[PDB]
Amino acid sequence: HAQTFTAAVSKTAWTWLTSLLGGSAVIIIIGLVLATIVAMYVLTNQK
Amino acid sequence: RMVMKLESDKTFPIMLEGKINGYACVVGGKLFRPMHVEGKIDNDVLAALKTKKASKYDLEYADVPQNMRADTFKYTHEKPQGYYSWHHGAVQYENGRFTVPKGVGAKGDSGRPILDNQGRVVAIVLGGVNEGSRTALSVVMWNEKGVTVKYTPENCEQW
Amino acid sequence: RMVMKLESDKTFPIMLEGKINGYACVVGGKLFRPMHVEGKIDNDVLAALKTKKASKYDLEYADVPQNMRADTFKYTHEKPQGYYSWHHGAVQYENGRFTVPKGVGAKGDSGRPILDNQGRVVAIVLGGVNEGSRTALSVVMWNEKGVTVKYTPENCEQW
Amino acid sequence: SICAAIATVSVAASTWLFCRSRVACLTPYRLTPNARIPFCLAVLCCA
């Protein structure tokens, strides 16, 4: 046969990699959404 | 008439190398000092107080002791259009802006509370930019719900 | 002169050690006195009257006999801004807070009732904290819904 | 090592934006002389 780059990566390894890379992006998105909401709220409550 | 609004000893100067560069004012049981003004308050008990900064609103606030809470300015959440009293002279509020005659407010004329016709603070001025005859002012006021909105003219000039 | 002429004999000192330590007041058919004062009420009928304890609100109350409900203080639920009558002097209600001038009020003054200009009790005090030239008071009042909100300032010196 | 570094950077950045949002949502209400903050604490319990 021939060896592919991702040939030997198991499902468990894939889930762990997605949790580490893919969960951190989720946390970043949550933080960005919270920051945008807070900024919009404070800006709209000035006037 | 106008002299009956300058007998407020509750304000405190800021000393820097023996010179005056700003005023720290106590309102509603909290001491507000402009952040950009460097120096030390003359009063020892207020100088010893540790203050928490506020970069966005450009002033640092501290909690005054219990014994000093009695003699303190009173803030107002309503700002009717028209006349207002200040130490330098008369001020006028129009369309959400404070305006004063030209040359009013200069080096070391920030942190001064702006008094109302009743005799209680409505806002604190931190700087002003000249606009023709009437100089506009950058000033932090208080909303009806208590959000401490700040109104600042474009290209504001410090003090 | 006029602030002290509003004199009512319904208030009753509490006796122990043979000295004044506080006053218990009959309002609206209930006799109120704090935890702080120990001893017996001067009125023997009320002295022998059993009391129910409310530790969290710092006052125990007793149900007066049906005959004595005719002559008692009348409670108040609205608190207009400004000065109020009292045993000692005018008491200023400002910013939802009862305040008295310097020196007024000390140990043994707890339990006295604060009334209004009409001549009816608006609240009853339990202690006072010196805030400076103006002294704040720990006091319980009456609301429109009858929830009896009590106001206890920070680190109050407990009368 | 790359995954751990990315995760740590993401967590630190999310914490930084959360703290900045809390400051920007509280200071307009915090520096009021009487310090009345019912609304923000009721809607999000920031403190």
UniProtKB/Swiss-Prot annotation, chain A:
<feature type="topological domain" description="Cytoplasmic">
    <location>
        <begin position="41"/>
        <end position="47"/>
    </location>
</feature>
<protein>
    <recommendedName>
        <fullName>Spike glycoprotein E1</fullName>
    </recommendedName>
</protein>
<comment type="function">
    <text>Class II viral fusion protein. Fusion activity is inactive as long as E1 is bound to E2 in mature virion. After virus attachment to cell receptor LDLRAD3 and endocytosis, acidification of the endosome induce dissociation of E1/E2 heterodimer and concomitant trimerization of the E1 subunits. This E1 trimer is fusion active, and promotes release of viral nucleocapsid in cytoplasm after endosome and viral membrane fusion. Efficient fusion requires the presence of cholesterol and sphingolipid in the target membrane.</text>
</comment>
<comment type="subunit">
    <text>Interacts with spike glycoprotein E2. The precursor of protein E3/E2 and E1 form a heterodimer shortly after synthesis. Processing of the precursor of protein E3/E2 into E2 and E3 results in a heterodimer of the spike glycoproteins E2 and E1. Spike at virion surface are constituted of three E2-E1 heterodimers. After target cell attachment and endocytosis, E1 change conformation to form homotrimers. Interacts with 6K protein. Interacts (via fusion peptide loop) with host LDLRAD3 (via domain LDL-receptor class A 1); this interaction mediates viral entry to the host cell.</text>
</comment>
<feature type="transmembrane region" description="Helical">
    <location>
        <begin position="20"/>
        <end position="40"/>
    </location>
</feature>
